């Protein structure tokens, strides 16, 4: 394999997400570049993430996360259970993005993850439209009643009828029939897709998991979902990570399958155990139909070699190396 794992607290999906971000090489390098200053890594999320990444890249033994979880404050089962995985992703990404504000690696995070969409609500019978353009760093895909990810995307951009009791509140126009919908303008180099298998059911008053089968491909063409395609850069996406959950409301187990280089050589990361596996273990075996994927990472075929550029010892600033080496000395005696 050539890759090292993470130690297993009740941190659930974190290790899975941490490996996922570590192997986003371009992000890893920018996190290395981010200027930071501190004697303890637990003293900020940027420091702690720099440390975790440094150790994943250099240790031969499983890497600890105590100082990382201390730095962002999620130290109980309940703090992970109250959040979706992208909320933790945002917590880490947003902080690091704001740490890069006015630095040499400024804008790295939106460059890698941010796409553009536009939502609209058009009234049928009156002249009112509420066209709102917004930016995204991840996409929450509905899987209920969807056999595969193409149907998720179809349902995502489907026009919703606001009619009957759903009649749009058009303010001074009163209740109005209208047509809701969203359009993709761009798709980012690195595409985070949550599969919304976990949801609160208000009918039964319970959190539930949907274990139905839901297929996703090695290569994901998304040109059909763009408002305007680019003939020079078809939106073909290459599957990078499959974040997997096993279990029910009484316990569960999280692993991530990752092909770090985007070549197809897949390795399963199960906390401290990292092992080469087959493409079938990574993909089809996680289709479900209680162990299945709840989040995927895809990378644009055209950006693959930039996003997954090698990150050598040379790409880590000496000031950081020295900070981490001093910390390791103080932790050794």
């Amino acid at each position: 394999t050539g890759y090292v794992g993470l130690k297993n607290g009740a941190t659930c999906y974190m290790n899975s997400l941490l490996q996922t971000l570590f192997f986003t090489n371009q992000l890893r390098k920018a996190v290395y570049m981010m200027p930071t200053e501190g004697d303890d890594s637990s003293k900020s999320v940027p420091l702690a993430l720099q440390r975790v990444f440094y150790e994943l890249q250099h240790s031969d033994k499983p890497v600890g996360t105590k100082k990382l979880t201390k730095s962002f404050g999620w130290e109980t089962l309940d703090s992970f259970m109250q959040h979706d995985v992208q909320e933790l992703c945002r917590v880490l990404l947003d902080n690091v993005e704001n740490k890069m504000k006015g630095t040499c690696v400024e804008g790295t995070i939106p460059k890698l993850f941010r796409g553009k969409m536009v939502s609209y609500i058009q009234c049928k019978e009156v002249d009112y439209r509420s066209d709102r353009r917004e930016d995204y760093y991840d996409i929450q895909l509905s899987i209920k009643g969807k056999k595969n990810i193409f149907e998720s995307f179809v349902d995502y951009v489907a026009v919703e009828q606001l009619d009957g009791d759903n009649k749009y509140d058009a303010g001074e126009h009163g209740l109005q029939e209208a047509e809701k919908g969203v359009k993709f303008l761009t798709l980012p180099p690195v595409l985070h897709l949550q599969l919304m298998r976990f949801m609160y059911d208000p009918q039964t008053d319970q959190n539930i998991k949907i274990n139905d089968r839901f297929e996703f491909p090695e290569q994901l063409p998304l040109d059909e979902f763009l408002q305007k395609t680019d003939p020079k850069d078809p939106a073909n996406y290459i599957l990078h990570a499959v974040l997997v959950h096993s279990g029910d409301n009484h316990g569960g187990h999280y692993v991530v399958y990752l092909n770090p280089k985007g070549d197809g050589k897949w390795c399963k990361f199960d906390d401290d155990v990292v092992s080469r596996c087959t493409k079938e273990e990574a993909i089809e075996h996680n289709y479900g139909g209680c162990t299945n994927a709840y989040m995927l990472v895809y990378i644009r075929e055209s950006k693959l070699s930039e996003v997954l550029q090698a990150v050598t010892d040379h790409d880590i600033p000496q000031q950081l190396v020295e900070r981490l080496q001093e910390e390791k000395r103080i932790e050794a005696q």
Partner: peptide
């Protein structure tokens, strides 16, 4: 807004 439990759901999806 449930007693946890090992199924994570955002509280922003619980109202």
């Amino acid at each position: 807004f449930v007693t946890x439990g090992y199924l994570x759901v955002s509280x922003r999806r619980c109202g």
